[PDB]
Symmetry: C2
Subunit: 140 residues, 2 copies
DNA sequence: ATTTTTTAAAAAAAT
DNA sequence: TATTTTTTTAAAAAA
């Protein structure tokens, strides 16, 4: 599968967009036999996510803010795992690929991505901003 | 006791030092009946700590780096609790006073300060740089 | 005043 | 290999 190189190029375009960005992504997806619609959806979700990060002061300011995940970030997470799974990638490999260890689609580690993916599937969390909850005993 | 206002003024001077800084601190300590030597020691330890933070990219860069505590920061911690205890302050009050909730001598919460103080006293940790250890199971 | 327990997240083993 | 549970660490607050 060429899903990794496609996602990599999608991020490359989001980080430096031009009037031919989406056309190039469609072409790359087509040549790889990857669904064009889902490829473009990811490009647009990623664009929004990065725009949101900037509205939150930037990647560094965001990674340390009180927000663990943004609603758009979770939408992106679900779309990324879904397209990669359809392309026959193993879960462990997807978590690695999307993380800080590789493509850096998300400013998250493979475990942050994978634990969240399963909580999302188990409906332990909703598709909405998720605040960083503090540890420690609860007040009396 | 006037230990809180003394520490506050010590930090005020460290944040904007002049040729009369230490003289003013000595005077304030004297008028409050607080040991002058320990007051000056704290001024110098605090100065070093803030210089170290700057060498580590700044307060924001440091609070998120892989270092939990700096050696000089622990030396400062011990000196601050010691002088405050001698001035009859309760432990809970000291942790609050030195923290982000009040004087901000340290870029730490009252619990980070208090838990570390006791680990230091119990010799569970040494007076040296302490790295931020990651959570999670240990590898097989 | 000092120690222990609890919680939440992250990491990786267990299933 | 997909999903769940356990473990560890730090932080928060009870014990």
């Amino acid at each position: 599968s060429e899903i990794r190189k496609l996602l990599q190029e999608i991020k490359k375009q989001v980080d430096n967009p031009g009037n031919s960005s989406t056309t190039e992504i469609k072409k790359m997806a087509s040549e790889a036999g990857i669904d064009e619609q889902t490829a473009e959806e990811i490009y647009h979700l990623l664009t929004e996510f990065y725009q949101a990060v900037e509205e939150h002061g930037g990647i560094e300011k965001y990674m340390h803010s009180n927000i663990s995940w943004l609603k758009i970030e979770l939408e992106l997470l679900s779309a990324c795992y879904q397209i990669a799974i359809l392309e026959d990638m193993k879960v462990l490999d997807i978590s690695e690929m999307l993380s800080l260890n590789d493509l850096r689609i998300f400013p998250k580690t493979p475990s942050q991505l994978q634990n969240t993916y399963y909580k999302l599937k188990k409906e332990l969390i909703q598709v909405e901003d998720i605040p960083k909850n503090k540890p420690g005993r609860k007040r009396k």
